[PDB]
Amino acid sequence: HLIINVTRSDSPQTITFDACLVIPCGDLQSQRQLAAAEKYLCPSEADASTLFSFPFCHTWEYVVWTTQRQDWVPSQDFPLAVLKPYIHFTKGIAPPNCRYNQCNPVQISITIPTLQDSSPTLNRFYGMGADVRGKDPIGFFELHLSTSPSLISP
Ligand SMILES: *[C@@H]1O[C@H](CO)[C@@H](O[C@@H]2O[C@H](CO)[C@@H](O[C@@H]3O[C@H](CO)[C@@H](O)[C@H](O)[C@@H]3O)[C@H](O)[C@H]2NC(C)=O)[C@H](O)[C@H]1NC(C)=O
């Protein structure tokens, strides 16, 4: 699966990549249809050995971020909704002659410093979907924060 490698920083940090690295969009003609569609992002509680038993963006309650301008109000009782202020999820625009895996630019902006971990960690799996008019295609990916052990680290 796709692993997004994030270098821990003391400042905010934006990340641009193509949604169809994550979402099963299909061939190029299908990706071009998806270019103008909205995307959404769901944090998951699955690990590497349980990926197949926690389906991603399975209900509306798992959606914490969307590429819409109006900001998505997460589910009050979803435990991972607290991650909401740490991430902004936006949609880019692609040229009309866009090429494979380059018609759906999205941006993940980590709004907090990352040298230390957040109380619910950002280092986890995430689901991504495309707001389409048939069954939304849904994929997942791993957000991996780099680590560098300190000198006094035991
Ligand atoms: C995030 O970092 C990991 C490594 O910690 C990347 O995983 C590895 O990515 C490389 C690059 O695509 C994959 O192939 C590589 O090919 C080069 C040929 O120059 C070779 O020198 C490397 O040793 C490696 O074989 C590799 O399959 C993949 N997995 C492993 C275990 O290395 C990952 O790609 C990075 N994420 C992104 C978005 O780049």
Author numbering: 53 to 206
What does the paper say about this structure?
EnvP(b)1 is an endogenous retroviral envelope gene found in human and other primate genomes. EnvP(b)1 has the characteristics of a classical gammaretroviral envelope protein. When ectopically expressed, human EnvP(b)1 can mediate fusion of cells in culture. EnvP(b)1 has all the hallmarks of a viral fusogen that has been repurposed to perform a host function.
We determined the crystal structure of the human EnvP(b)1 iRBD. Single anomalous dispersion (SAD) from a platinum derivative was used to obtain experimental phases and ultimately produce a model. The iRBD’s core is defined by a β sandwich that shares some similarity with a V-type Ig fold, although it lacks the first β sheet at the N terminus. Extensions between the β sheets form a series of loops and α-helical regions that decorate the core. There is weak sequence identity between these features and the gammaretrovirus variable regions A, B, and C (VRA, VRB, and VRC, respectively), which are believed to dictate Env-receptor interactions for gammaretroviruses. The iRBD shares little (∼20%) sequence identity with these examples, yet it shows extremely strong structural similarities. The EnvP(b)1 iRBD is more compact with shorter, less prominent loop structures extending from its core. All three VRs are shorter in EnvP(b)1: VRA and VRB are dramatically shorter, and the VRC, also shorter, adopts a different conformation as it is liberated from constraints by the absence of the paired Cys residues that form a disulfide in FrMLV and FeLV. As a consequence, the potential receptor-interacting interfaces of EnvP(b)1 are quite different from those for FrMLV and FeLV. The β sandwich core, a central helix that runs perpendicular to it, and an 8-amino-acid loop between the last two β sheets are all structurally conserved.
